[PDB]
């Protein structure tokens, strides 16, 4: 049936319907800090989210997405290893059933509690649909979450979760500022990859921040109370919606810092 994260439709089965799963630039990958190359020509990231307009939060059966109005250059990402302007379209998380797992990318094999993905698309392509067909169509900003102190900025997200408990449910989610989810440093690693969920298209430039943000145990606990199923179906807790690290193959991970 449809793909998921369970025994019978999880990541190890994806290749049957999405051959690209065994591709050359699949994500996520493990970031080996001792072999990542410092590239002094990498420009600083330019995150301009002051004009971001969030619209809705949705449980899509795989995770929960917070959607933004991307009809204009309101919230953009430029700089870094990017050429062109990329508009923020949505953000979501991947998390685990336990604090020791949840992230998709790993650093020196270390797994974090969760991983935030801020998804952006290259404006030169006109729409997201066209951007996914290009090798540089998307830019995903990845931020690791570790359990510790509460992140004030994440609480509005946490509080609205009860409203979108099951697949298909959505709630109005305006005036959310994504700047409240960024760590203080924007140092990062970058490599060419893919979407980590089917269709697994290899159109992503990954920008993974070195500094994780901390969230309280109570905050991540609420992520774990969401459901993969729709209303009236057998309850399956939405946990461990992450894909294991893929082989790096002929790729090099660059670092913006020494
Ligand atoms: N401007 S808006 O009306 O608020 C709007 C909000 C969300 C989406 C969406 O989530 N589609 C998913 C989606 C992506 F988020 C991608 F990044 C992508 F590449 C896709 F192909 C895709 F279908 C589209 C438009
Ligand atoms: N975790 S992550 O790598 O940052 C990631 C970000 C966005 C998307 C996404 O927009 N997929 C929706 C989507 C569809 F639902 C389609 F049906 C389709 F054809 C797409 F191209 C598409 F992007 C998937 C994974
Ligand atoms: Hg592509
Ligand atoms: Zn993701």
Q: Provide the number of structural domains found in the chain.
A: 1
Q: Using CB atoms within 10 A of its CB, is residue 31 exposed (0-12), middle (13-18) or buried (19+)?
A: buried
What six digits make up the tokens of 114? 């969760």
Ligand 1 centroid to residue 121 C-alpha, Å: 9
- Which residue ranges make up the annotated binding site? 92, 94, 117, 196-197
Annotation marks residue 13 as catalytic = no
d(CA 208, CA 25): 16
Closest CA to 139 of 120, 117, 116, 115: 120
Ligand 1 close to Cβ of residue 199 (< 6 A): no
**Ligand 2 atom with the shortest distance to the CA of 142:** 4
**Ligand 2 atom with the shortest distance to the CA of 94:** 1
Ligand 3 centroid to residue 147 C-alpha, Å: 34
- For atom 9 of ligand 2, the residue with the nearest CA is 195
| DSSP output for 178-232 | GGGG--S---EEEEEE--SSTT--S-EEEEEESS-EEE-HHHHHHHTT-BSSPTT
* H or E segment to which residue 155 belongs: helix 155-160
Strand partners, 177: none
Ligand 2 close to Cβ of residue 195 (< 6 A): yes
Ligand 3 centroid to residue 128 C-alpha, Å: 11
**Ligand 1 atom with the shortest distance to the CA of 203:** 19
d(CA 33, CA 37): 9
Q: What is the CA radius of gyration of the chain?
A: 17
Ligand 2 close to Cβ of residue 140 (< 6 A): yes
Closest CA to 88 of 108, 73, 110, 98: 73
Half-sphere exposure of 75 (CA within 13 A, CB side): 23
d(CA 83, CA 127): 17
Q: Find the CATH number of the domain harbouring 172.
A: 3.10.200.10
Experimentally determined by: X-ray
Whether omega before 28 lies within 30 degrees of 0, making that bond cis, reads yes
Do residues 145 and 115 touch, judged by C-beta distance below 8 A? yes
Domain membership of residue 127 as a residue range: 1-258
What six digits make up the tokens of 135? 């090798």
């Amino acid at each position: 049936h449809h793909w998921g994260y369970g025994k019978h439709n999880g990541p190890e089965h994806w290749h049957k319907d999405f051959p690209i799963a065994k591709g050359e630039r699949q994500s996520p990958v493990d970031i080996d800090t001792h072999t990542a190359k410092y590239d002094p020509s990498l420009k600083p990231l330019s995150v301009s989210y002051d004009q971001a307009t969030s619209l809705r939060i949705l449980n899509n059966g795989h995770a929960f997405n917070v959607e933004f109005d991307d009809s204009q250059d309101k919230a953009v990402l430029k700089g870094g290893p990017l050429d062109g302007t990329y508009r923020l379209i949505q953000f979501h998380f991947h998390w685990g059933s336990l604090d020791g797992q949840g992230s998709e990318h790993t650093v020196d094999k270390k797994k974090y509690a969760a991983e935030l993905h801020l998804v952006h698309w290259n404006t030169k392509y006109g729409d997201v649909g066209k951007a996914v067909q290009q090798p540089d169509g998307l830019a995903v900003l990845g931020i690791f979450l570790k359990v510790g102190s509460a992140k004030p900025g994440l609480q509005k997200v946490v509080d609205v979760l009860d409203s979108i408990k099951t697949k298909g449910k959505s709630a109005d989610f305006t005036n959310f500022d994504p700047r409240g989810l960024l760590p203080e440093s924007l140092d990062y690693w970058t490599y060419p990859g893919s979407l980590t969920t089917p269709p697994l298209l290899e159109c992503v430039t990954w920008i993974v921040l070195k500094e994780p943000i901390s969230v309280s145990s109570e905050q991540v606990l609420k992520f774990r109370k969401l459901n993969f199923n729709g209303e009236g179906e057998p309850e399956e807790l939405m946990v461990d919606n992450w894909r294991p690290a893929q082989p790096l193959k002929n790729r090099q991970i660059k670092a913006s810092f020494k």
